[PDB]
Each structure stands twice: as C-alpha cells, then as structure tokens.
Amino acid sequence: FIGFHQFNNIAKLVASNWYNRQIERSSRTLGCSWEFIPVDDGWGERP
C-alpha cells in the first residue's frame, strides 16, 4: 500500500508490504489511509 516512511528527516511516499500484513483498522493512525481533496465551491480558498 501507498504510505510514507522517515528517511533522515524526510517523510517519503512509499509502497510497503508491511501494510498488507496488518489488520484493517489498527489504532486510528494508519499512514496508508488517504483523502482526495478536489476544489469545491463550498470551501473555495485561492489555489
């Protein structure tokens, strides 16, 4: 799954099978869970 990992002080986007070894909801804090935010008239800041 796509997620992130610390390399030095950089958090780099990673695909890591370590996620696939995990059960579903674990904590609330995953690292492989994402949100997709489209520009929406209801929010409307300046891109």
Partner 1 sequence: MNINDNLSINSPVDNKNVVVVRARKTDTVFKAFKVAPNIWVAPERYYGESLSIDEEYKVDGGIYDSNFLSQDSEKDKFLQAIITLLKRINSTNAGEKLLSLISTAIPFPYGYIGYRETNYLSSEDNKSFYASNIVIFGPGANIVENNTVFYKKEDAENGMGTMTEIWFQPFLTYKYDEFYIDPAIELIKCLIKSLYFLYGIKPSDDLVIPYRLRSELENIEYSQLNIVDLLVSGGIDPKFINTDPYWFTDNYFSNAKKVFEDHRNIYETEIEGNNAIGNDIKLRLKQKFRININDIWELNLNYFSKEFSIMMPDRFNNALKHFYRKQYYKIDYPENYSINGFVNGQINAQLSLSDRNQDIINKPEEIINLLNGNNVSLMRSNIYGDGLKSTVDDFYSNYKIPYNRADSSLDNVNIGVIDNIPEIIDVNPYKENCDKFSPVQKITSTREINTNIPWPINYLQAQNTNNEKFSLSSDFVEVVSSKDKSLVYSFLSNVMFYLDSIKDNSPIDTDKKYYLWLREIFRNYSFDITATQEINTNCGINKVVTWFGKALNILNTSDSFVEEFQNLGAISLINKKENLSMPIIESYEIPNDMLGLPLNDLNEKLFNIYSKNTAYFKKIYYNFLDQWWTQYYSQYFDLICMAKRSVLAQETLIKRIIQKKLSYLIGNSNISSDNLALMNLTTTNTLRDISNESQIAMNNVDSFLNNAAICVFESNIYPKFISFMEQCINNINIKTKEFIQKCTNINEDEKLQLINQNVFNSLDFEFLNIQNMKSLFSSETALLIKEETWPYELVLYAFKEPGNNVIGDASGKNTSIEYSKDIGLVYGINSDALYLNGSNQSISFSNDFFENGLTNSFSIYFWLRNLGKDTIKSKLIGSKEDNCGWEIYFQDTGLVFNMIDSNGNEKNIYLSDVSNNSWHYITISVDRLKEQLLIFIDDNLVANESIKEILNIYSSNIISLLSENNPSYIEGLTILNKPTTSQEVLSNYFEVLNNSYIRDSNEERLEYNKTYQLYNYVFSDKPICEVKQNNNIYLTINNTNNLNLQASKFKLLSINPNKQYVQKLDEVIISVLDNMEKYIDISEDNRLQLIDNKNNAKKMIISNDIFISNCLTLSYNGKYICLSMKDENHNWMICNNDMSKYLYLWSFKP
Which lies closer to partner 1 via its Cβ, residue 25 or residue 46? 25
User: Which spans of this chain sit near partner 1 (rule: CB under 8 A)?
Assistant: 6, 8-9, 17, 20-23, 26-29
Minimum CB distance to partner 1, residue 43 (Å): 21
Is residue 32 within 8 A of residue 47, CB to CB? The reply is: no
Tokens of 15: 């695909």
Which lies closer to partner 1 via its Cβ, residue 15 or residue 39? 15
Which lies closer to partner 1 via its Cβ, residue 28 or residue 46? 28
For the chain, how are helix, strand and coil distributed in percent, rounded to 5?
Answer: 0, 25, 75
